C-alpha cells in the first residue's frame, strides 16, 4: 500500500490524478520514474509519478 505524498494532477486520460491522503496499490516499480498503481475505490489503473507517492 503506498500513499500520495503530493496531489498528482495528471493531464492525459492515461494516468489517474490523485490528491494527498489518497492511497494507491503500486503495481510495477523498480526503476522507471513513473510507476503504475491501481485505485481501490472504483478499481481503475493509472501511471502514478514516483515522486508524488511513498511506501507507507
Amino acid at each position: 500500500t503506498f500513499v500520495a505524498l503530493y496531489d498528482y494532477e495528471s493531464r492525459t486520460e492515461t494516468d489517474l490524478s490523485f490528491k494527498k491522503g489518497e492511497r494507491l496499490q503500486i503495481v510495477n516499480n523498480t526503476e522507471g520514474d513513473w510507476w503504475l498503481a491501481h485505485s481501490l475505490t472504483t478499481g481503475q489503473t493509472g501511471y502514478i509519478p514516483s515522486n508524488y507517492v511513498a511506501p507507507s
Binding site: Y6, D7, P49, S50, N51, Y52
Partner: peptide
Amino acid sequence: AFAPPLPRR
C-alpha cells in the same frame, strides 16, 4: 506548496 516538477517520461 508546489510539488516537484514531474520528471520526463
